[PDB]
């Protein structure tokens, strides 16, 4: 039995960051710090934290600024460092509450881009990285001219909606898409320029920065992902400095592998990967 507690801290710029803590009723094996994707929130990951809890893992999952229960203007960010700083603070919170426990940083989509940028900047603040379709190659979705424009707009008008997303691409399960379509805490609009710039900054420097990752890395990706092409994850595992890197491709799965029909096989692979290394 894994149980959720809701807590908070003061993030960068004194924005209240809400985060959940999922504690299992068994002896804690290690801690997981989880970063959700664009426009979603940590409560869409309940079933993930429960599955990890059944493996004796404590899961820290924060609502990013402008997301879910956290403060700030909705999906507003002026720099990727705002996300990575709030994630860094959350990693430190788990490090102090569970000292000596191994630390697993886990990110999905934009969360995967934040976990990546956090990791290459603090490659010894964590022990294991798991990335679910990380948004580390956003510049492959637009022309270079559009990337020049989006970076500039992310500065001047970070709140301007700039890019529409196909929400039907998140899952092959129509129930998942409809539950996403009707979630009051999900951003039901377009990608803003500020987040567009942040993802583009991470993407252009991913090849040059990835060598800084030295901890074991697990990348998960569905082959039929229309939001983030799988080639972005193939280029990532070819570019990281980690010796123990692995990409699990899931034939036919859509973007959110954690919410797919095959999600239990996906999470079985995550637990199996973590337990060989803990
Ligand atoms: P993840 O967080 C999954 C959430 C979506 C259900 O992110 C998925 C992919 C996000 C990529 C967004 C596009 C990044 C670049 C967009 C900027 C280009 C638009 C600029 C137009 C200027 C004329």
Author numbering: 2 to 279
Quoted passage from the original study:
One of those enzymes is the mycobacterial monoacylglycerol lipase Rv0183, also termed mtbMGL, hydrolyzing monoacylglycerol (MG) into glycerol and an unesterified fatty acid (FA). The biochemical characterization of mtbMGL showed a strong preference for monoacylglycerols (MG) and suggests it as a secreted lipase. mtbMGL belongs to the family of serine hydrolases, with an α/β-hydrolase core fold and a distinct cap domain. The active site is formed by residues Ser110, His256 and Asp226. In this work, we determined the crystal structures of a surface-entropy reduced variant K74A Rv0183/mtbMGL in its free form and in complex with a substrate mimicking inhibitor.
The complex structure of mtbMGL K74A, with the bound substrate analog Maglipan, mimics the transition state intermediate of 1-oleoyl-rac-glycerol (1-OG) in the active site of the enzyme. The active site of serine, Ser110, and the central phosphorus atom form a covalent bond; fluorine has been replaced in the nucleophilic attack of the hydroxy group of Ser110. The backward-facing oxygen atom O19 of the covalently bound compound Maglipan is also coordinated by two hydrogen bonds from the backbone of Leu39 and Met111 that form the oxyanion hole in the active site. The short butyl group of the substrate analog faces toward the end of the long cavity of the active site. The central phosphorus atom of the ligand bound covalently to Ser110, and the extended aliphatic chain expands through the hydrophobic tunnel formed by residues Val147, Ala150, Ala151, Leu154, Val163, Gln164, Gly197 and Leu200. Cap helix 1 (Pro145-Val157) and the residues from the subsequent loop (Val163, Gln164) interact with the tip of the alkyl chain. In the complex structure, cap helix 1 adopts an intermediate stage between the open and closed conformation. The ligand dives deeply into the lipase to the active site within the core domain, whereas the end of the alkyl chain still projects into the exterior of the substrate-binding cavity. The loop regions of chain B are poorly defined, and the B-factors are higher than in chain A; the average B-factor for chain A is 35.9 Å2 and for chain B, 56.0 Å2. Nevertheless, there is density visible for the ligand in both chains.
